[PDB]
Design a protein around this ligand. Sequence first.
Ligand SMILES: [Zn+2]
Length: 298
Amino acid sequence: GLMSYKQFIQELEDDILPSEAERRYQEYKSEYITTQKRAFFNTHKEEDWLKNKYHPTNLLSVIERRNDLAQKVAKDFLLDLQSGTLDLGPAVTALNAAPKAPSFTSDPKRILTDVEQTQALVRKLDSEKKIEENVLQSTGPVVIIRGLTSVKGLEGVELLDTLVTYLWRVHGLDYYGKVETNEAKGLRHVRDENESKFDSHWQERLKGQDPLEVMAAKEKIDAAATEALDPHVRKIRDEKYGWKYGCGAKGCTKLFHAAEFVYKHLKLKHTELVTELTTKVREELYFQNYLEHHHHHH
Ligand SMILES: [Zn+2]
């Protein structure tokens, strides 16, 4: 446990110095916390719970399970919409009292704004997750549901509630709660300072990328993995055909016409030479994600 200032002083009070004390306690604080965080990492670094949160390799398949689940859940969500069998309750999986939003949400003009943003988010996250067909994605937006038995038009609050629910059930995005988690649970939030940030939050979300995908940083990792392989790709001029690129592993004599071709070849015919050349970046990023994104109690 982190010593309060009061307690730290005591094993020094022999020849006291007020400002040497503050220097040392600050140092103590700094060193304690860095060390606790490493300790915790080293206790759990091996467990899958932690790896599924911060490790770039695991993340990739966390994303693939997420997407598959979502596609199937959207299929189902839309079926109940189509049959008028759908519930707009605040549960994550309903038929299977809630936290309230900052009351700037009472506003009926808010509704017109929320419908666009909401439909914008559904479009974004559907693309991210490869959900391809969705009816839910001058005037405000109108959606017509050609059902089994009969049609339903959706326009204002009803369209809004359908969309908000969709976001929560399929994408674990709690619109009114300004939060999205990978395996959301429980009840989503129902209906100046707050209002400018609310839009900002969701607007930058519309601009950026999937949080999980950002964690996973696959681009960054492929880049770093390719760089590590450079020493093992011989560049050679051909007498006629420009540059040919030769594989620099041992026992091996294969020749390729582009550099990407050698990289691809290396992680298929020299798996372990690659694994050995690329472990550090993966595991350093693992460590870095944990440090940045994990709530530590101190
Ligand atoms: Zn080779």
